[PDB]
Swiss-Prot record:
Domain SH3: 4-65
Native organism: Rattus norvegicus
Cofactor: Mn(2+); Mg(2+)
Cited InterPro entries: Csk-like_SH2, Kinase-like_dom_sf, Non-receptor_tyrosine_kinases, Prot_kinase_dom, Protein_kinase_ATP_BS, Ser-Thr/Tyr_kinase_cat_dom, SH2, SH2_dom_sf
Protein name as it appears in the record: Tyrosine-protein kinase CSK
Record key words, sorted: Acetylation, Adaptive immunity, ATP-binding, Cell membrane, Cytoplasm, Immunity, Kinase, Magnesium, Manganese, Membrane, Metal-binding, Nucleotide-binding, Phosphoprotein, SH2 domain, SH3 domain, Transferase, Tyrosine-protein kinase
């Protein structure tokens, strides 16, 4: 079947054109299909700037979503909860360098490396502490992939170096999955310029990819890389003008895992507010930011996703002032959470829902109209939930429009079901804007 009009394809190679009708393009460029020609090998398509022309199907890769199934993985040789004996069975015919990683039955929370040395299969314990992996407690690693790169390059103490992986069955190489779905990027074209932020769950760096500024993120404490997979996957499925856009994924076999994202020149919404402040940001600007976030959220709810981590810090601003939700690490379909932003039922119940997201939206608005100030200002972090559950609610910020504050309050009802829908939030923020109840 030919690619329907509107299909997106990423260029695998540079195309210089064979005829005058042809549309040239560079490797990595995004092409939107217009229509297939009389010859299935060529399509009419447009580039980002809109220019149309003919291009070869062979040269482009259809871009599509990737589902982080329970079988999707970056470690063929990883076998999850496999038992010692099982590894012995999986590794029965004595082969030097035949290895496989499994979780640790023996020592809970850690992992175990299993190798076939000399008619025997050695089992080395991999300790997980302070978010790092280590066998000899001399060399540490961020993930099991780097550990395998290492011990494959040299035995470095082990009875033998690793040579051949015992590929678990059902494993789906995420590297070619993201590759075939048009989301794979090349490390050689990425130059990491500087670190924009070193956070608790990941790092973000400004970079240069094929000439354009880009944001690169890596995820901490993710030994199996599943946090990485989960975040990348969901991102390949999100497409809204108020959601930070995924540009691609970078997987170095050594173990460096990165998520390349559009660059947002103005930094987090928190900072933008604090820097420019009250004397610069008018009411329209503040309401405009609220609507931006609200639409992003209505989109997520409409696609059955729960953000679970909505806050001014996780909202970035582009060069021309468009606020976009970012940081989709905790994003999952209707099911640690930041206490000051999370709804009571959410911290207590094991399931999260859009209604908790709405609660967080309420908190975020307060952040917006407070110009970055931190939630629950004069209260100890150990009183919040109990005070809140005892009906406490922050005071409307200084100079906050009463109508805006009522939206906040409406987000803070203790009975989740009574909280507004994101569409109802948009409608009310629009009702406010329409009558200028914010000016």
């Amino acid at each position: 079947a030919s690619w329907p009009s509107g299909t997106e394809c990423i260029a695998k190679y540079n195309f210089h054109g064979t005829a005058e009708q042809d549309l040239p393009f560079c490797k990595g460029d995004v092409l939107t299909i217009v229509a297939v020609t009389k010859d299935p090998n060529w399509y009419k398509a447009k580039n980002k700037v809109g220019r149309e022309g003919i291009i070869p199907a062979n040269y482009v890769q259809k871009r599509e979503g990737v589902k982080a199934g329970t079988k999707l993985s970056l470690m063929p040789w990883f076998h999850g909860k496999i038992t010692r004996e099982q590894a012995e069975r999986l590794l029965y015919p004595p082969e030097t360098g035949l290895f496989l990683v499994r979780e640790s039955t023996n020592y809970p929370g850690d992992y175990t490396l299993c190798v076939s040395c000399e008619g025997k299969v050695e089992h080395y314990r991999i300790m997980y502490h302070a978010s790092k992996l280590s066998i000899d407690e001399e060399v540490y690693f961020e993930n099991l992939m780097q550990l395998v790169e290492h011990y494959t390059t040299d035995a470095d103490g082990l009875c033998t170096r690793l040579i051949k992986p015992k590929v678990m069955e059902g494993t789906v190489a995420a590297q070619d999955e993201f590759y075939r779905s048009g989301w794979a990027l090349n490390m050689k074209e990425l130059k990491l310029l500087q670190t924009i932020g070193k956070g608790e769950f990941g790092d973000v760096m400004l970079g240069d990819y094929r000439g354009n500024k880009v944001a690169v993120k890596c995820i901490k404490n993710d030994a199996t890389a599943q946090a990485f997979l989960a975040e990348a996957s969901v991102m390949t499925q999100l497409r809204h003008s108020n959601l930070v856009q995924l540009l691609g994924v970078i997987v170095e076999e050594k173990g460096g895992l990165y998520i390349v994202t559009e660059y947002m020149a103005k930094g987090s919404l928190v900072d933008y507010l604090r820097s420019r402040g009250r004397s610069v940001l008018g009411g329209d600007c503040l309401l405009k930011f609220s609507l931006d976030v609200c639409e992003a959220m209505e989109y997520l709810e409409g696609n059955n996703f729960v953000h679970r981590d909505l806050a001014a810090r996780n909202v970035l601003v582009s060069e021309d002032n468009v606020a976009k939700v970012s940081d989709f690490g905790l994003t999952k379909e209707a099911s640690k959470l930041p206490v000051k932003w999370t709804a009571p039922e959410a911290l207590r119940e094991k399931k999260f829902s859009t209604k908790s997201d709405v609660w967080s939206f309420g908190i975020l608005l307060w952040e917006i109209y407070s110009f970055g100030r931190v939630p629950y200002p004069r209260i100890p972090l150990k009183d919040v939930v109990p005070r809140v559950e005892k009906g406490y609610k922050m005071d409307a910020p200084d100079g906050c429009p009463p109508a805006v504050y009522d939206v906040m309050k409406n987000c803070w009802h203790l009975d989740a079901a009574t909280r507004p829908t994101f569409l109802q939030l948009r409608e009310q923020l629009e009702h406010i804007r329409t009558h200028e109840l914010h000016l």
